[PDB]
Write a protein that binds this ligand. Structure first.
Ligand code: ATP
Ligand code: ATP
Ligand code: ADP
Ligand code: MG
Ligand code: MG
Ligand code: MG
Lengths: 68, 193, 321, 54, 319
């Protein structure tokens, strides 16, 4: 194994607060309720922009191109 | 010719699968490999079968599919929202966009930050995942020495530290991915049998 | 190849007899000597309790299960053979036995016809009757799980070969067991001797420990009986017909006096023991036994006598336990 | 003690009467005699105990 | 039209929430705490998927521990015969399939084939396991992915597949000893390990007392069940009414308000502090799941802090 990543779960006020806030925000963001196809794509892009600097599909294409 | 069978995921639980025979003409051959999950666009055709009639006792016609297009659905359940036969293929404009993105100084930081955006932290598990996804360059020195060019990663952590979600994201992003569980995998289910 | 009005009159005349219980107990096992309690329990199991089909509640089983464990010298398989000869419906099986058809439903191939056929097991074929299992000790894990499911849900479910079906198995069980060694050791508890899971052993309403203790008087009397083999008794056919009629027509119902007696008996049994002398299962078992006893007398009402008889049979088995 | 093969049971009885009946058949005399029963008992003893004690 | 009027009448009731709890498994006596858990499990939580294909579970798992003869099985029996999709099984499964999937090959030529399991068959339903404390090793490892990832992954000779297992597990287990030892903690009384214990949203413990009054009350109730038959059971709402209302509630998809979000973070912080290891990140989502289910019971599309508080008590009771 080239890289080993050990993950520890420790109780910390600041870390717990930040993680809980992010998890709650993500859960609210993914709520199903929260041209027509173009409008859907635009709202999906707006939702994605919050948490990722690069579009996911563009990222997959980038990875494939770089590998090939 | 291939034997198309209902995928385990879509068949009702505990019921026998149904199958059809798909005919692949020129330029379509070898595109689908056994054990894969594919979506087949074709023509639904029927023909007279004597043995069928004989066996059934009724005038029943055999059925086949003449493949028009094949889309590799294996490991692409979460990518069904896109369009095109291949979602990992690119156009010339997209290649220019890739070059423009790459020329940026902070490309690596953005790439790492874009790995599993829904997972809060673990910037050390995202860096390793990105490195594994991109991989290295295999080498063959003078045709005698072979050096591996892939990166393996192991996550040894606490029960609720978002490891399975990371694996699922890697499966979604990778061009060809396979997911297996601990005891669900046999010594020859991996490798070859 | 090599029920009438008179039959009903004869049945009613027999029922009117005062010593009907003893007569039936004797007629069940003429050749078995000095096992009155076991014979009474077997009779009550044969008659069975009342099946309740509840709206809002579900299904409450009226069957009675009896376990015949103890020393190998005593007669235990002959009792099962007699029960088979008497019960209108039932099958004979031994755990881990290739000769028997099987205890669980399975999917097989019809050699004759080269066709796929779903064959029902012994428990399914015993629906509404008594299933006698000769050798409970040696049994497959799978078979034990099937037995647990049958005694819990009363249905067998199979989801193999592309078939998803559930088969009714509303049948009573009368199993026999032997100790781990050459004899049953009184010092150790019953659970250790019988070598069965505590869960599966706690589902039998009545548990009988027939032990061949070496007693001069008992040995002499048994020898006299056996050598002589070389109180009226009813024919087997009439007994089977009587059981069939009682199980088909009579349906007893609990009354206020029966309710009071049952509540008082359960409270008293609980107060005996901290050690738990009895559980709620010991109340449903008493209810079933009282209903079966009422069935035996061709009564549509459960009275105080039936409850008194039930508490006594249940208590004697608990005392062994 | 642990030396005994097993406790006598009514099965041992039935076997004893079976052996006595077989010996009577051998004798060609209808009535089973005490000698036949004694012979069966001694056969039962010498089948196991005779060699075990050695 | 008549049914609609009944539906509107039920939601108009002020004490609707209490009545539903009291109308679950009326045969069982004096176990309102367990009934509330089963009702919430049936309603379930909103299933959500992130913007990159990561799935967030929305099903509630309940484990019931109790001494023998405590109506543990009765709860599973009622759920089996009431919920639309459900399967009754036991940890010591007879079938080669078991809880999870298994592979069977017709002898010779014929290739390996997939045989459905308990969890598979109960897809989009509730799988009731009679004895969770006796599951096979294979199943114990296998059930790790099913309870959280909602999938079953198999890679055997010539066959590889991912099987949907979107089910809610309602399991009943016995204490490791003969009876529940109050002195020891819940972890000690249970053979379950930390990973599995975290995947369960709620825990319920049923004890066996010996008080005369309790025994008399329980003993009489059972007798009247056989005596009065259906007349003995008079729940506020019949099975048909409850079934229709539950289906109506599942249509709602409540959201989290701004006040609830801030309150939600604070409660998780307090819960983690007391732990310092039953508490983890999975419990933060469990409160979200329970909060949605409680909102559905009230037929309300916005989760208020009061609903969040109610979820907090239920998790604390499990500790
Ligand atoms: N009360 C009794 N009356 C008559 N015979 C009896 C009695 N008790 C024991 N026996 C005799 O004991 C022998 C027991 O035979 P049986 O076939 O019932 O054994 P079993 O219980 O199946 O034995 P094992 O556990 O060794 O398999 C029979 O010969 C039976 O005659
Ligand atoms: N609170 C109760 N109300 C009514 N009946 C009860 C109650 N508690 C126990 N019982 C009775 O207990 C009997 C036996 O219990 P049940 O079959 O539900 O499983 P259990 O013994 O608790 O579980 P297990 O099989 O895991 O030991 C049931 O028939 C039920 O009538
Ligand atoms: N760092 C994190 N950021 C966001 N969500 C998290 C994080 N850690 C855990 N979670 C949540 O908790 C759950 C963890 O389950 P999972 O990671 O599948 O278990 P395991 O770690 O055993 O594979 C996930 O559903 C995930 O949404
Ligand atoms: Mg995991
Ligand atoms: Mg026998
Ligand atoms: Mg149970």
């Amino acid at each position: 194994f080239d890289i080993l990543c050990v993950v520890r779960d420790l109780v910390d006020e600041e870390a717990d607060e930040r993680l809980a806030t992010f998890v709650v925000d993500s859960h609210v963001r993914s709520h199903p309720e929260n041209n027509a196809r173009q409008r859907r794509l635009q709202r999906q892009r707006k939702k994605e922009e919050e948490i990722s600097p690069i579009p996911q599909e563009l990222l997959m294409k980038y990875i494939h191109y770089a590998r090939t | 010719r291939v034997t198309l069978q209902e995928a385990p995921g879509t068949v009702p639980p505990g019921r026998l699968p149904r199958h059809r025979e798909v005919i692949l003409l020129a330029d379509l051959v070898d595109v689908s490999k056994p054990g894969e999950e594919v979506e087949v666009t074709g023509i639904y055709k029927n023909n007279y079968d004597g043995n069928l009639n004989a066996k059934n006792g009724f005038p029943v016609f055999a059925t086949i599919i003449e493949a028009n297009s094949i889309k590799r659905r294996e490991g692409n359940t979460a990518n069904e929202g896109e369009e095109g036969l291949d979602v990992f293929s690119w156009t010339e404009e997209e290649e220019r966009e890739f070059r423009k993105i790459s020329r940026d100084r902070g490309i690596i930081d953005k790439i790492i930050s874009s790995m599993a955006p829904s997972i809060y932290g673990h910037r050390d598990i995202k860096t390793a995942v990105a490195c594994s996804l991109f991989g290295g360059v295999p080498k063959n020195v003078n045709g005698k020495h072979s050096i591996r060019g892939d990166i393996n990663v192991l996550l040894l952590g606490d029960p609720g530290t978002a490891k399975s979600q990371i694996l699922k994201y890697v499966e979604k992003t990778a061009h060809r991915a396979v997911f297996a569980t601990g005891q669900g995998a046999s010594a020859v289910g991996l490798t070859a049998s | 190849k090599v029920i009438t009005d008179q039959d009903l009159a004869k049945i009613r005349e027999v029922a009117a007899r005062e010593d009907l219980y003893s007569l039936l107990a004797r007629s069940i096992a003429p050749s078995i000597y000095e096992l009155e309690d076991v014979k009474k329990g077997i009779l009550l199991q044969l008659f069975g309790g009342t099946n309740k089909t509840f709206t809002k509640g579900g299904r409450y089983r009226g069957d009675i299960n009896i376990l015949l464990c103890g020393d190998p010298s005593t007669s235990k398989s002959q009792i099962l053979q007699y029960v088979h000869k008497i019960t209108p419906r039932g099958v004979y099986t031994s755990g881990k036995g290739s000769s028997a058809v099987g205890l669980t439903a399975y999917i097989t191939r019809d050699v004759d016809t080269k066709q796929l056929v779903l064959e029902s097991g012994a428990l399914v074929l015993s629906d509404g009757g008594v299933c006698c299992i000769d050798e409970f000790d040696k049994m497959s894990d799978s078979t034990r799980s099937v037995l647990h499911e049958v005694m819990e849900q009363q249905t067998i479910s199979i989801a193999k070969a592309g078939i998803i079906t559930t088969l009714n198995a509303r049948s009573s069980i009368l199993a026999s067991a032997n100790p781990i060694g050459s004899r049953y050791n009184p010092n150790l508890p019953v659970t250790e001797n019988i070598d069965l899971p505590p869960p599966l052993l706690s589902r039998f309403d009545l548990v009988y420990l027939v032990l061949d203790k070496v007693d001069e008087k008992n040995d002499r009397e048994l020898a006299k009986h056996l050598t002589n083999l070389y109180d009226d008794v009813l024919p087997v056919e009439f007994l089977t017909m009587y059981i069939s009629y009682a199980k088909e027509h009579i349906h007893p119902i609990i009354t206020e006096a029966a309710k009071t007696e049952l509540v008082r008996a359960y409270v008293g049994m609980r107060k005996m023991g901290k050690r738990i002398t009895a559980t709620t299962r010991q109340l449903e078992s008493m209810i079933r036994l009282a209903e079966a006893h009422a069935k035996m007398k061709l009564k549509n009402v459960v009275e105080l006598e039936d409850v008194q008889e039930a508490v006594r049979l249940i208590r004697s088995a608990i005392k062994d336990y | 003690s642990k030396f005994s093969f097993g406790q006598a049971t009514p099965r041992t009885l039935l076997g004893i009467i079976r052996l006595s009946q077989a010996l009577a058949k051998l004798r060609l005399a209808d009535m089973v005699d005490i000698d036949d029963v004694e012979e069966a008992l001694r056969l039962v003893r010498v089948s196991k105990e005779s060699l075990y004690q050695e | 039209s008549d049914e609609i009027n009944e539906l509107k009448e039920m939601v108009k009731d002020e004490h609707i929430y209490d009545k539903l709890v009291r109308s679950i498994a009326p045969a069982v006596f004096g176990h309102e705490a367990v009934k509330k858990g089963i009702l919430l499990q049936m309603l379930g939580g909103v299933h959500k998927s992130t913007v990159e294909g990561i799935k967030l579970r929305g099903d509630i798992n309940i484990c019931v521990v109790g001494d023998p003869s405590t109506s543990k099985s009765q709860f599973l029996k009622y759920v089996v015969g009431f919920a639309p999709r459900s399967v009754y099984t036991s940890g010591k499964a007879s079938s080669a399939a078991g809880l999870t999937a298994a592979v069977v090959r017709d002898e010779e030529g014929g290739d390996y084939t997939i045989e459905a399991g308990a969890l598979m068959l109960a897809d989009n339903g509730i799988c009731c396991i009679d004895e969770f404390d006796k599951m096979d090793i294979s199943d114990q490892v296998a059930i790790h992915e099913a309870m959280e990832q909602q999938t079953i992954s198999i890679a055997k000779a010539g066959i590889h597949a991912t099987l949907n297992a979107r089910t809610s597990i309602l399991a009943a287990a016995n204490p490791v000893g003969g009876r529940y030892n109050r002195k020891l903690s819940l972890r000690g009384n249970l053979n379950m390990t930390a990973p599995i214990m975290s995947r369960f949203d709620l825990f319920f413990v049923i004890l066996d007392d010996c008080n005369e009054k309790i025994d008399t009350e329980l003993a009489s109730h059972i007798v009247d069940l056989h005596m009065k038959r259906d007349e003995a059971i008079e729940p506020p709402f019949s099975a048909e009414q409850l079934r229709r209302y539950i289906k109506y509630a599942r249509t709602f998809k409540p959201i989290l308000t701004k006040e609830a979000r801030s309150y939600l973070v604070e409660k998780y912080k307090e819960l983690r502090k007391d732990d310092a290891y039953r508490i983890t990140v999975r419990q933060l989502e469990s409160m979200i799941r329970l909060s949605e289910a409680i909102a559905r019971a009230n037929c309300v599309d916005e989760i208020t802090p009061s609903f969040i508080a109610e979820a907090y008590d239920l998790l604390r009771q499990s500790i």
